[PDB]
Amino acid sequence: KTNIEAYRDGLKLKTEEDFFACDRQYVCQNYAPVPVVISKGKGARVWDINGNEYYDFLAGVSSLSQGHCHPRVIAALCRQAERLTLTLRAFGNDVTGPACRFMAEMFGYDRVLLMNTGAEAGESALKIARKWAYEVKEIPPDSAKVILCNNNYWGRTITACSSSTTFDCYNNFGPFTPGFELIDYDDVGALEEALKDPNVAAFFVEPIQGEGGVNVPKPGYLKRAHELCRSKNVLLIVDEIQTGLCRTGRLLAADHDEVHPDILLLGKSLSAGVVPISAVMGRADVMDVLKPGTHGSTFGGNPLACAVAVEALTVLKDEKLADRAERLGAQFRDCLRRELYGKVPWIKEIRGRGLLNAVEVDSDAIDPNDVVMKLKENGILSKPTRGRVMRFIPPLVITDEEHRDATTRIIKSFLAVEEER
Amino acid sequence: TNIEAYRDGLKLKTEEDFFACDRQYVCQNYAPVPVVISKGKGARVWDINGNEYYDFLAGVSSLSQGHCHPRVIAALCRQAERLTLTLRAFGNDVTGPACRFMAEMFGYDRVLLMNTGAEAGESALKIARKWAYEVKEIPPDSAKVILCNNNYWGRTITACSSSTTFDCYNNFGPFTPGFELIDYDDVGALEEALKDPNVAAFFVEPIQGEGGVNVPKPGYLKRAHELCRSKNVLLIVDEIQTGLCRTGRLLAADHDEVHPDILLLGKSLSAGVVPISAVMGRADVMDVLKPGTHGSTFGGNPLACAVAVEALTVLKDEKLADRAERLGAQFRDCLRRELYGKVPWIKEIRGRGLLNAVEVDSDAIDPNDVVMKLKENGILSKPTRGRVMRFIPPLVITDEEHRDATTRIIKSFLAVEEERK
Ligand SMILES: *[C@H](CC(=O)CCC(=O)O)c1c(COP(=O)(O)O)cnc(C)c1O
Numbered sequence A: 001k002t003n004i005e006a007y008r009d010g011l012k013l014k015t016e017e018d019f020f021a022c023d024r025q026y027v028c029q030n031y032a033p034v035p036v037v038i039s040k041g042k043g044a045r046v047w048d049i050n051g052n053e054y055y056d057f058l059a060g061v062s063s064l065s066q067g068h069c070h071p072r073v074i075a076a077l078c079r080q081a082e083r084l085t086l087t088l089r090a091f092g093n094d095v096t097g098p099a100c101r102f103m104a105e106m107f108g109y110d111r112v113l114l115m116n117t118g119a120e121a122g123e124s125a126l127k128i129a130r131k132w133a134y135e136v137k138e139i140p141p142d143s144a145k146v147i148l149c150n151n152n153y154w155g156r157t158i159t160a161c162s163s164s165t166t167f168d169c170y171n172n173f174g175p176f177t178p179g180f181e182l183i184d185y186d187d188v189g190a191l192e193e194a195l196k197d198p199n200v201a202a203f204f205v206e207p208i209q210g211e212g213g214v215n216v217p218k219p220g221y222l223k224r225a226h227e228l229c230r231s232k233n234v235l236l237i238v239d240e241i242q243t244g245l246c247r248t249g250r251l252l253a254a255d256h257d258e259v260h261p262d263i264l265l266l267g268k269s270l271s272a273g274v275v276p277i278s279a280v281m282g283r284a285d286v287m288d289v290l291k292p293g294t295h296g297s298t299f300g301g302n303p304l305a306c307a308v309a310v311e312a313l314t315v316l317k318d319e320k321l322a323d324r325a326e327r328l329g330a331q332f333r334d335c336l337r338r339e340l341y342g343k344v345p346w347i348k349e350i351r352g353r354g355l356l357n358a359v360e361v362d363s364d365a366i367d368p369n370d371v372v373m374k375l376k377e378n379g380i381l382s383k384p385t386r387g388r389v390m391r392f393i394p395p396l397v398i399t400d401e402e403h404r405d406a407t408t409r410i411i412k413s414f415l416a417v418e419e420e421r
Numbered sequence B: 001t002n003i004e005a006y007r008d009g010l011k012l013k014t015e016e017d018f019f020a021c022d023r024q025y026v027c028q029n030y031a032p033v034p035v036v037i038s039k040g041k042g043a044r045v046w047d048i049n050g051n052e053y054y055d056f057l058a059g060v061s062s063l064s065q066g067h068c069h070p071r072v073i074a075a076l077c078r079q080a081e082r083l084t085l086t087l088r089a090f091g092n093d094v095t096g097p098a099c100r101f102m103a104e105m106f107g108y109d110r111v112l113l114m115n116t117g118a119e120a121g122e123s124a125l126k127i128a129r130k131w132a133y134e135v136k137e138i139p140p141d142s143a144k145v146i147l148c149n150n151n152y153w154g155r156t157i158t159a160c161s162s163s164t165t166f167d168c169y170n171n172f173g174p175f176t177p178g179f180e181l182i183d184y185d186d187v188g189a190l191e192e193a194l195k196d197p198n199v200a201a202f203f204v205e206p207i208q209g210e211g212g213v214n215v216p217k218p219g220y221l222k223r224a225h226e227l228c229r230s231k232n233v234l235l236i237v238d239e240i241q242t243g244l245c246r247t248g249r250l251l252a253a254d255h256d257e258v259h260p261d262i263l264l265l266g267k268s269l270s271a272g273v274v275p276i277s278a279v280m281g282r283a284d285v286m287d288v289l290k291p292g293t294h295g296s297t298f299g300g301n302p303l304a305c306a307v308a309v310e311a312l313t314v315l316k317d318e319k320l321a322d323r324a325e326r327l328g329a330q331f332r333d334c335l336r337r338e339l340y341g342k343v344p345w346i347k348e349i350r351g352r353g354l355l356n357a358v359e360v361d362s363d364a365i366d367p368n369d370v371v372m373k374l375k376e377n378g379i380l381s382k383p384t385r386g387r388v389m390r391f392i393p394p395l396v397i398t399d400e401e402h403r404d405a406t407t408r409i410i411k412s413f414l415a416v417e418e419e420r421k
């Protein structure tokens, strides 16, 4: 027994309520109450402390695309952990360079910056874009602007809160970092107007807004936005932290528009949910503005995380998970539309790409939480966003049989909430 | 594993094969490195050729427990086979107990777990600001945070906005407002800054780390806390580098009997295995972070929690604070006896526990000569500010290893003085 096991045994926590109580007393209260206490995970399934099985339809908001506890990923983690886990980038090691080359070739970029979290990747991208704009575009000192979209989500740092339109994200956290211009998402005309400001350094966008509600933009949005940006020598920063890595049926969601972002951000399933590792990738003349001493991170690029990420990325390609997500996701949306539209009137839209799907409900006709509990009653764990946006984000490794099963279970949940209404 | 297979395929034999790989594919934000490490164990590391060295950087105090500590690796691997990530959107059977473990060890009501040191600082600033607005009722957006010249807390834009280090902030603006910078180890300056009633907090290190292992005068922190209480100003103490037995005490703040209003931990909190940081505080302060007002994908993940509890246990079981205290005092006593006077270009020998530095006069010697000589003699070290040599070995360094190392360190400075003549 490891220390955490022995300490927990000592607390005599028997019921879920015992754990909830432990949360309320000792854990910062920055998350809402949970409906379950998970003890183990494997592939697309998880089990609570009572042995009840569920299908995880949140998957770390697309951090567990390879499934919980993927054997190859866990073996890569353990083998590297017995050898070397951290050197700092102050010293070299035999893993960091190779892992970056691996990523540079898979994604087609000259330089890779490894950080730890999604927020750090975003911060790093904003720093690169501002320094690039001052040094290469020669914009006046402190005048750089970055354009982003309403309802964007990229992190919880002060700079991220300073660029959010979500009240709870920014309220009472100021004063704020200046230099952001917010525009409506999926609106090329608004981007075109904002790009008239010659001090713009970058346009930072999600190919499909994640936390914003699985907001899928109109056809051509990202391609059109890239051209407008290029026309003005503005960097297009594409946040693929939630949408990349096969989640949408393509290696990158940007691929749906044949867009190669000027700066790409990856995170989440980059590690298959095993350890926090994020990446910022770009061409040499952009990324090289980060000279020695101008940026750093204690754990960024550590060898354990590099080993893990290389194995996690290989699983995506070896298990053909992009093909899997495209095939299963189309079947998911087709089955939900066929059995739910018309029959369940309070469903507003069934949308998504690949296995990044959402069912937005009308909160003035139904209580969204009822859907969430019925889903749970039927063995489906999910967490909505914005209250009314139900999300279906299972691991991509979910088998044909398990996905058929889960699909039936999800439909059964929506119809039972209707029959009950 | 995939990282090992891919590396072999690349046919990287020499240290230069790796330096080149690293130059071509890795973002170039770190200076050239002198070595290619392939294995770590305890206080020792080996390069790709089998050459052995004593690691005297230890992740800048992230590896206090040593490289690849068997118990920590075992805890990692046991938990990784079970469950690594649920998000705080769902409960698990590890996070709560781990936070309780930490709350009792450090004596706080609430524990917020983040991933990196930078995230811990960002989170503490958000708390202090939201607390200032909600509890002190200061005017909206007027919150000020006092910090010290040469502080280091991270690389987010907000951290760059509060830095006085040129490379950290240059060309990264516009900057987050709301910071008042004062000299470090200057109670008079703090007392003056505290007359502003919009101040929410004073954010400080017990010993400035990246700033050069700057040890303040006796009573600094005790005096600073009294001044802050008098003004209902929170004292945020950053123990990410100083904490966890490094200075001979559980927290460096203990030296002054100061219990920080907000404490920050990171680095050795995980024994350098995975990134996990913590922000701890009393209920009436931490509870301002209501549901939806702060978050993080990986923060509080169960794998990191399991690792942290084992890492923290190692500190106590192995009496690493006693070890650091004893060997530290010996290291400084030995260097001062053998080097002061004899080596005129040594400005000062300072530190607490095993957080020690030798500042050299860079106009009288090339500090890099000292670094390469140390390396030639089996000691890997990385200075800060060019001229501050740093000696920060894992606290698990044995009596013999430390005697041998000290001898080798003393020997290097003497060879450099010999050469000057
Ligand atoms: C992550 C979004 C989330 O799923 C947040 C969930 C939570 O519990 O906080 C995300 C980020 C931020 O990455 P982290 O800092 O959380 O690693 C950035 N960009 C996108 C598109 C995200 O989805």
Ligand SMILES: C=C(CCC(=O)O)/N=C/c1c(COP(=O)(O)O)cnc(C)c1O
Pocket (backbone or CB within 6 Å): A088, A089, A090, A295, A296, A297, A298, A299, B059, B060, B116, B117, B118, B119, B121, B152, B153, B154, B155, B205, B209, B210, B238, B239, B240, B241, B242, B266, B267
């Ligand atoms: C060692 C470093 C930086 C090393 C590097 O970026 O290579 N300092 C980290 C640090 C930090 C930042 O932690 P990080 O974000 O690197 O985890 C915060 N506070 C204190 C007192 C610290 O010493």
